[PDB]
Amino acid sequence: EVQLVESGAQVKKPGASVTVSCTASGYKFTGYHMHWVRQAPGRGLEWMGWINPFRGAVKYPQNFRGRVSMTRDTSMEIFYMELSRLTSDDTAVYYCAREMFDSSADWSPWRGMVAW
Amino acid sequence: NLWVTVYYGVPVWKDAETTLFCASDAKAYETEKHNVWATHACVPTDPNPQEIHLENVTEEFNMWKNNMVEQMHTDIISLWDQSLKPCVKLTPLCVTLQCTNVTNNITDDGELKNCSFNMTTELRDKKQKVYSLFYRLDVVQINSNKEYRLINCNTSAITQACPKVSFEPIPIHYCAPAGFAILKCKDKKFNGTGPCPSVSTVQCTHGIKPVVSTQLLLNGSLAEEEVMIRSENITNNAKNILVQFNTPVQINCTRPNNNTRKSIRIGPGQAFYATGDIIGDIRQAHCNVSKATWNETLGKVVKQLRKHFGNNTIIRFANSSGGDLEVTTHSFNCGGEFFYCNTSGLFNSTWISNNDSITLPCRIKQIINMWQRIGQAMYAPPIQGVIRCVSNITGLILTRDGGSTNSTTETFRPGGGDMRDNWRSELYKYKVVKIEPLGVAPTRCKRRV
Amino acid sequence: IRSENITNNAKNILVQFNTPVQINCTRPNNNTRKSIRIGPGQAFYATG
Amino acid sequence: NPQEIHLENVTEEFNMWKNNMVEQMHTDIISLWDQSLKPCVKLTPLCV
Amino acid sequence: VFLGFLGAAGSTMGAASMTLTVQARNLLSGTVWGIKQLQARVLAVERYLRDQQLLGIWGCSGKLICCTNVPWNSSWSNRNLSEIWDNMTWLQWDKEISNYTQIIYGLLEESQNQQEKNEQDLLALD
Amino acid sequence: VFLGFLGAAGSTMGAASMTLTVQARNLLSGTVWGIKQLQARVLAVERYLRDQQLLGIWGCSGKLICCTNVPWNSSWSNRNLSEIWDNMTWLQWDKEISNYTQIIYGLLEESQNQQEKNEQDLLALD
Amino acid sequence: VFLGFLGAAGSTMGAASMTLTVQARNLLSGTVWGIKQLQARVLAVERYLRDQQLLGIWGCSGKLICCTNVPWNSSWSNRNLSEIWDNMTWLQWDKEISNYTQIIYGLLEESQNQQEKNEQDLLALD
Ligand SMILES: *[C@@H]1O[C@H](CO)[C@@H](O[C@@H]2O[C@H](CO)[C@@H](O[C@@H]3O[C@H](CO[C@H]4O[C@H](CO[C@H]5O[C@H](CO)[C@@H](O)[C@H](O)[C@@H]5O)[C@@H](O)[C@H](O)[C@@H]4O)[C@@H](O)[C@H](O[C@H]4O[C@H](CO)[C@@H](O)[C@H](O)[C@@H]4O[C@H]4O[C@H](CO)[C@@H](O)[C@H](O)[C@@H]4O)[C@@H]3O)[C@H](O)[C@H]2NC(C)=O)[C@H](O)[C@H]1NC(C)=O
Ligand SMILES: *[C@@H]1O[C@H](CO)[C@@H](O[C@@H]2O[C@H](CO)[C@@H](O[C@@H]3O[C@H](CO[C@H]4O[C@H](CO)[C@@H](O)[C@H](O[C@H]5O[C@H](CO)[C@@H](O)[C@H](O)[C@@H]5O)[C@@H]4O)[C@@H](O)[C@H](O)[C@@H]3O)[C@H](O)[C@H]2NC(C)=O)[C@H](O)[C@H]1NC(C)=O
Ligand SMILES: *[C@@H]1O[C@H](CO)[C@@H](O[C@@H]2O[C@H](CO)[C@@H](O[C@@H]3O[C@H](CO[C@H]4O[C@H](CO)[C@@H](O)[C@H](O[C@H]5O[C@H](CO)[C@@H](O)[C@H](O)[C@@H]5O)[C@@H]4O)[C@@H](O)[C@H](O)[C@@H]3O)[C@H](O)[C@H]2NC(C)=O)[C@H](O)[C@H]1NC(C)=O
Ligand SMILES: *[C@@H]1O[C@H](CO[C@@H]2O[C@@H](C)[C@@H](O)[C@@H](O)[C@@H]2O)[C@@H](O[C@@H]2O[C@H](CO)[C@@H](O[C@@H]3O[C@H](CO)[C@@H](O)[C@H](O)[C@@H]3O)[C@H](O)[C@H]2NC(C)=O)[C@H](O)[C@H]1NC(C)=O
Ligand SMILES: *[C@@H]1O[C@H](CO[C@@H]2O[C@@H](C)[C@@H](O)[C@@H](O)[C@@H]2O)[C@@H](O[C@@H]2O[C@H](CO)[C@@H](O[C@@H]3O[C@H](CO)[C@@H](O)[C@H](O)[C@@H]3O)[C@H](O)[C@H]2NC(C)=O)[C@H](O)[C@H]1NC(C)=O
Ligand SMILES: *[C@@H]1O[C@H](CO[C@@H]2O[C@@H](C)[C@@H](O)[C@@H](O)[C@@H]2O)[C@@H](O[C@@H]2O[C@H](CO)[C@@H](O[C@@H]3O[C@H](CO)[C@@H](O)[C@H](O)[C@@H]3O)[C@H](O)[C@H]2NC(C)=O)[C@H](O)[C@H]1NC(C)=O
Ligand SMILES: *[C@@H]1O[C@H](CO)[C@@H](O[C@@H]2O[C@H](CO)[C@@H](O[C@@H]3O[C@H](CO)[C@@H](O)[C@H](O)[C@@H]3O)[C@H](O)[C@H]2NC(C)=O)[C@H](O)[C@H]1NC(C)=O
Ligand SMILES: *[C@@H]1O[C@H](CO[C@@H]2O[C@@H](C)[C@@H](O)[C@@H](O)[C@@H]2O)[C@@H](O[C@@H]2O[C@H](CO)[C@@H](O)[C@H](O)[C@H]2NC(C)=O)[C@H](O)[C@H]1NC(C)=O
Ligand SMILES: *[C@@H]1O[C@H](CO[C@@H]2O[C@@H](C)[C@@H](O)[C@@H](O)[C@@H]2O)[C@@H](O[C@@H]2O[C@H](CO)[C@@H](O)[C@H](O)[C@H]2NC(C)=O)[C@H](O)[C@H]1NC(C)=O
Ligand SMILES: *[C@@H]1O[C@H](CO[C@@H]2O[C@@H](C)[C@@H](O)[C@@H](O)[C@@H]2O)[C@@H](O[C@@H]2O[C@H](CO)[C@@H](O)[C@H](O)[C@H]2NC(C)=O)[C@H](O)[C@H]1NC(C)=O
Ligand SMILES: *[C@@H]1O[C@H](CO)[C@@H](O[C@@H]2O[C@H](CO)[C@@H](O)[C@H](O)[C@H]2NC(C)=O)[C@H](O)[C@H]1NC(C)=O
Ligand SMILES: *[C@@H]1O[C@H](CO)[C@@H](O[C@@H]2O[C@H](CO)[C@@H](O)[C@H](O)[C@H]2NC(C)=O)[C@H](O)[C@H]1NC(C)=O
Ligand SMILES: *[C@@H]1O[C@H](CO[C@@H]2O[C@@H](C)[C@@H](O)[C@@H](O)[C@@H]2O)[C@@H](O)[C@H](O)[C@H]1NC(C)=O
Ligand SMILES: *[C@@H]1O[C@H](CO[C@@H]2O[C@@H](C)[C@@H](O)[C@@H](O)[C@@H]2O)[C@@H](O)[C@H](O)[C@H]1NC(C)=O
Ligand SMILES: *[C@@H]1O[C@H](CO[C@@H]2O[C@@H](C)[C@@H](O)[C@@H](O)[C@@H]2O)[C@@H](O)[C@H](O)[C@H]1NC(C)=O
């Protein structure tokens, strides 16, 4: 099996910064992409980026770029995510997800999100 | 009435893959020094690298699925440890370090530490009290004066590549055995995929320095005519895109500090080569690149992108995103030492349609886990004095951005970090097949009774 | 019933079933694994 | 039976000093030496 | 004229039968990281002797050319003699015949040298 | 009829000469614990080429069958033709002939192809 | 008479053609420090099959003797038949001919079996 476990719910003031983790287990950590998605209450899914654990390759989207700091600890197998300049519009529920097919050598994908 | 007729040694081949073998020539073999980098057992290169052209042969080439890369990827890693195993294991070096901000007169806002720590000698009972100077990237503190410890101590057993073995990339010619061959795709404008118009067979590649480097390619092969744009699939931003220059680019990389190497005895037979105090001026590593040929390079490039993307559009360059230091910065070995450089001002630009040079900051890191494999680290001993290496830039690796705004502007930054892309630089024109010398075709012939 | 030599008691004798036999083996204790760092790269997995 | 066959009308020039069989024998004895010592007991702690 | 190894590949098969002595002459070509080069050159003699085995079990065993008493089924690439040797390269050709190759081979090894060679002794006993 | 590899073993030798193209076709079959599998497949080509060497130095070199100018000493399993091929399996037979095999082989390699092949050039020089 | 392996070397070549079945019969001979013995016996089959390859690509493939349709250039050791076989040992002889060996070999592999064997099918198609 595999598991994606995040940090706890936080209550903060506006204009501050907030970090959120994700801790994967049960698979090859360094070889599996990790998506991050926030969903505002009642809204749809908002994709915030991804981090390839291999050397830490990252790609973000346009609207979230510059407020988003995403890392991973390959030793301790913990993904991280950060949002700063806190606004009331940044209040949402944030997820971490993995792409379907991964490996240590060749790659693909885009679409896949399975473990959430 | 036709029959079947067997013909042995027919020009029928099929595509397959097997194990290849190196050729370092003989000149970098003489570098010796107890296994300089790769070349130890490497086979010599052909004095006349015979290149035979085949006619009426339409062969489909793929550099991205080419298997010769994964081999080259693994050998460099195995050969790496093959040096470290007889070399000195630094696992005892994990120790509490009392360090100080290095001696300078203010005007900072360090990174070098005068580190006094209790060590051991060749005699197992008596011990050692020594000082050494370390870059900030190899250690981390722990919570009177602050105490520090190495970065790998909680991850991987650390060794040190013995100073005899060097890291210097030595040109390597990969070769194929009998019943197989290697094919070189020579056509000038070639995107690496689809069919290859110009197909010639060789038994060995050209000189390929297995350059261990990121974000930039040095000393390799040059393209022809227009600067060629090669990508497996360009509609995917995630897939890396490789380029090849028709014009080589000059760079002068230096470590201006004059280092001392303190060899301390951890033996018998073991010993550790530390860093002594800099002699004279305190400077920092850097590399220079001409701004003129650089600006013209981006102009000749942006005209080539407007064949594949738009006739007239906007092109912007920006610095990288994030990841390990081996990605976010430029890694490579300059003569003994592994430099990590800030690349920003190169990519500060916005292009649309229609005398001095540059300079980049750099950092040196000795402990290196490169290829990320945990459980085993490596330490690069310091090299005495000012280090200088001149490199010629033959290639690039890039990634793309994302949807953003419809048909507005595309942004580009550094990328890669998987060394398989490093070997694709010289292997784009190569691939392997196997011979089927037996064949059966009809004719009026028939054997006897 | 298969034996190299049955007159010798010392030589082992092997048998083969026509009917397989069921067995359920359990360690009922619920263990904890304490991973303690002896490294770098070394570590020891203890019993909690 | 270490068969020794004689050849006739053969004039062969011999050199023992450039003979390569020596360098082999030279290296094997050294490698075989360590091949014993490697499973054997390392006295590196004996420096005291 | 010597065009070298695999020179006549894209050339038509009729033109490719002149290089058989070339492609068959170099076909045999006469610690760590040293293992890399050693396992490569082994696969040549296996690929070479497998053909020698096939060439041997068939009515050939002679190098570079051969024929057989097995007829050509028109279901195997029905074509005129000129549509094959003159109009088709060994690459384009063996593409078509890779279908029935072993079906062909079965009669070469069995219907021929398992049969025609048994005819020898029966004729050679008297 | 195809009975596979070694099908005719217990069958009489006369019945066992029909499988020669089978047993000779698969005879060549076309880090630690990886060494286990590698040294095994090497002994096949040595066993195969040793026969090819013997078959070559004798008057055969042709696969699956052969004859010779060496007579059969009645001291070698004196039997009628039917007492041998029809009445004896290759297992029961080679059991008897393992005696004189090399005595037989010596005349095949020497009295034949060392002799009869020297007769060629002396006849082929004129 | 059996003089063993390489017995006739210093003897004249005409006298050395009687041992061909000897020198060709034993030519194939049927962890650390264990690697020492293994790599040695591999070079025999390469040296053996390379000759078999050369013997095969030429008009021979038959063991111990052969001839060719390639004439002897008088520029190659101009000598009478008795000045060669009767007056010269294989050691003294091959010393002289090591010059043109491949020049000779080129016509054996190409002017013969690349040519004379193509003549077969053209004569064997009708
Ligand atoms: C004679 O033969 C018999 C029968 O062949 C042998 O019986 C075998 O006994 C084994 C133990 O001795 C036992 O091994 C365990 O198998 C478990 C099952 O693995 C499968 O299923 C899991 C999960 O699937 C389950 O859930 C899904 C979905 O809900 C269902 O579809 C399935 O049906 C299951 O219900 C899969 O993930 C696997 O891929 C397999 O398909 C294993 O989970 C277990 O491994 C765990 O413990 C290991 C030891 O520490 C550990 O290394 C491994 O990582 C596993 O750890 C679990 O928990 C950690 C917690 O962090 C988590 O990270 C891991 O991901 C994992 O969940 C054992 O391997 C065999 O199942 C059993 N049967 C067979 C057919 O082999 C008998 O032993 C044999 N006798 C002898 C003497 O040999
Ligand atoms: C960046 O580096 C690259 C590669 O180093 C430069 O690209 C070209 O490199 C090729 C060679 O890889 C040069 O092109 C040919 O080189 C042939 C090989 O020359 C060597 O071998 C010769 C015969 O064995 C030998 O005579 C010759 O010595 C010559 O140079 C010596 C110094 O290196 C000198 O001491 C000798 O006196 C003699 O002059 C070499 O050992 C050679 O036979 C051909 O004539 C031809 O030179 C290219 O010239 C290189 N340059 C270009 C522009 O293509 C690339 O230039 C570098 N780029 C920059 C910006 O510096
Ligand atoms: C103790 O264990 C032994 C061995 O495990 C049991 O002995 C018998 O085991 C054999 C197989 O080793 C079974 O006999 C046959 O098995 C054939 C192979 O079946 C596998 O492969 C099939 C095709 O690839 C596949 O369809 C099949 O799946 C089937 O079982 C799956 C669960 O294992 C199930 O999920 C599938 O839906 C499907 O039903 C297997 O992967 C099979 O093709 C034959 O039909 C036949 O089954 C015997 O049945 C086993 N039992 C007996 C009594 O002989 C032994 O029973 C065990 N004893 C006890 C007391 O438990
Ligand atoms: C004998 O040769 C035929 C035909 O080969 C045809 O000509 C060649 C020159 C090539 O261009 C081939 O690509 C071409 O087909 C072989 O035909 C086989 O036919 C089957 C259908 O009967 C094909 O199956 C297909 O499978 C795909 C993928 O699932 C489906 O999408 C298709 O709908 C179809 O079902 C098969 O691809 C095709 N080729 C092969 C190699 O099998 C035939 O197999 C061959 N026989 C032998 C013994 O070689
Ligand atoms: C030629 O063949 C003979 C006879 O072989 C006989 O027939 C076979 C089908 C088998 O059934 C054989 O078992 C059977 O003997 C070989 O005969 C050999 O004879 C000698 C005696 O002259 C036997 O020596 C025996 O040794 C045992 C053990 O020490 C003693 O107890 C006996 O008293 C006797 O001395 C020998 O066993 C026997 N077989 C062999 C294989 O040597 C003969 O050797 C053989 N010649 C050749 C060149 O193969
Ligand atoms: C064909 O054979 C000739 C002659 O070989 C002669 O007879 C043999 C039985 C031996 O006894 C040979 O030693 C003897 O020469 C080969 O002759 C070659 O001639 C060249 C000169 O044209 C010689 O070069 C010499 O080089 C030395 C060293 O630098 C100088 O001191 C001399 O002044 C001279 O320049 C060469 O040594 C000689 N032998 C060889 C093996 O090349 C000829 O090469 C050969 N051809 C072929 C294709 O084999
Ligand atoms: C040399 O070692 C000293 C040991 O402390 C390091 O000094 C520390 O420097 C930081 C600045 O990065 C100081 O933090 C600053 O605090 C002031 C006051 O609150 C605040 O206004 C600034 O914004 C900043 O947070 C820190 O206080 C200071 N340590 C002490 C004890 O004062 C110094 O950085 C080392 N040099 C290098 C190159 O590392
Ligand atoms: C390469 O082949 C061409 C001819 O190939 C033809 O087209 C192919 C698609 C296929 O259908 C073949 O069977 C065809 O034969 C050769 O062109 C010939 O060249 C000769 C001599 O130069 C000339 O006399 C012929 O008229 C040419 N024929 C044609 C159709 O152009 C060409 O020579 C081949 N390459 C080499 C090196 O021989
Ligand atoms: C297996 O062999 C039997 C006959 O073997 C005989 O007995 C042996 C001890 C030995 O002396 C042999 O030389 C003998 O020939 C085969 O039986 C024959 O089968 C055919 C066809 O079924 C029948 O016409 C013959 O009359 C049978 N002969 C006898 C003596 O029974 C049997 O067929 C063999 N097995 C197979 C698969 O062919
Ligand atoms: C060894 O050779 C001699 C003869 O060699 C001769 O001298 C050489 C330099 C070379 O020029 C050769 O071509 C010459 O033939 C053999 O001596 C002969 O022996 C036979 C039988 O004993 C006798 O009848 C001849 O007259 C001898 N000839 C001479 C010239 O002495 C000698 O036999 C050879 N060794 C063996 C074992 O046969
Ligand atoms: C790479 O260049 C080739 C042309 O040299 C492109 O052309 C393709 O060629 C194949 C033939 O194997 C055709 O099946 C495709 O339809 C062709 N596509 C196009 C767009 O021409 C190939 O597309 C190029 N690939 C990339 C990624 O640029
Ligand atoms: C990099 O350094 C080399 C020398 O190490 C410089 O090469 C000089 O180039 C100039 C022309 O620009 C020549 O006149 C000199 O003769 C060259 N000297 C040597 C020793 O080759 C090179 O210009 C430097 N490039 C940069 C960008 O700094
Ligand atoms: C020609 O071939 C026809 C088809 O044979 C069948 O298909 C091939 C691909 C094989 O799978 C084979 O085993 C099948 O039986 C035959 O029906 C026909 O008889 C053949 N004719 C001749 C003269 O050989
Ligand atoms: C038949 O064989 C008889 C016996 O030969 C002897 O025994 C065999 C086993 C070998 O060891 C052999 O070297 C011995 O000489 C001969 O005496 C007899 O001449 C032979 N007859 C024929 C026609 O070959
Ligand atoms: C005999 O040989 C003469 C010399 O050939 C030349 O020298 C030899 C060593 C080779 O290098 C060869 O390639 C050279 O061409 C020829 O000039 C002469 O024509 C030959 N005569 C015959 C009948 O073959």
Side-chain angles (χ1 to χ4, degrees), chain A residues 3 61 66 100 111:
Chain A
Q3 282 167 281
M100 282 225 61
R111 55 176 194 283

CSV table of all heavy atoms in Angstrom, one decimal, chain A residues 3 61 66 100 111:
chain,number,residue,atom,x,y,z
A,3,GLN,N,0.5,5.7,1.1
A,3,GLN,CA,-0.3,6.7,1.9
A,3,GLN,C,0.3,8.1,1.7
A,3,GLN,O,1.5,8.3,1.6
A,3,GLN,CB,-0.2,6.4,3.4
A,3,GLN,CG,-1.1,5.2,3.9
A,3,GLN,CD,-0.8,4.7,5.2
A,3,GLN,OE1,0.1,4.0,5.5
A,3,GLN,NE2,-1.6,5.2,6.2
A,61,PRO,N,1.8,26.3,-11.9
A,61,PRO,CA,1.0,27.0,-12.9
A,61,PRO,C,1.2,28.5,-12.9
A,61,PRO,O,2.0,29.0,-12.1
A,61,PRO,CB,-0.4,26.6,-12.5
A,61,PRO,CG,-0.3,25.8,-11.2
A,61,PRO,CD,1.1,26.1,-10.7
A,66,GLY,N,4.9,32.2,-7.6
A,66,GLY,CA,5.5,33.2,-6.8
A,66,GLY,C,5.0,33.2,-5.3
A,66,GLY,O,5.7,33.7,-4.4
A,100,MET,N,0.0,8.6,-12.0
A,100,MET,CA,-0.3,7.1,-12.0
A,100,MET,C,1.0,6.3,-12.2
A,100,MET,O,1.4,5.5,-11.4
A,100,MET,CB,-1.2,6.8,-13.2
A,100,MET,CG,-2.7,7.1,-12.9
A,100,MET,SD,-3.8,5.8,-13.5
A,100,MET,CE,-3.2,4.5,-12.5
A,111,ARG,N,-1.6,13.2,-16.8
A,111,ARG,CA,-3.0,13.1,-16.3
A,111,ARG,C,-3.0,12.5,-14.9
A,111,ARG,O,-3.7,13.1,-14.0
A,111,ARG,CB,-3.8,12.2,-17.2
A,111,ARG,CG,-3.2,10.8,-17.4
A,111,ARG,CD,-4.0,9.9,-18.3
A,111,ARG,NE,-3.5,8.5,-18.1
A,111,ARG,CZ,-2.5,8.0,-18.8
A,111,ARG,NH1,-1.8,8.8,-19.6
A,111,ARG,NH2,-2.1,6.8,-18.6
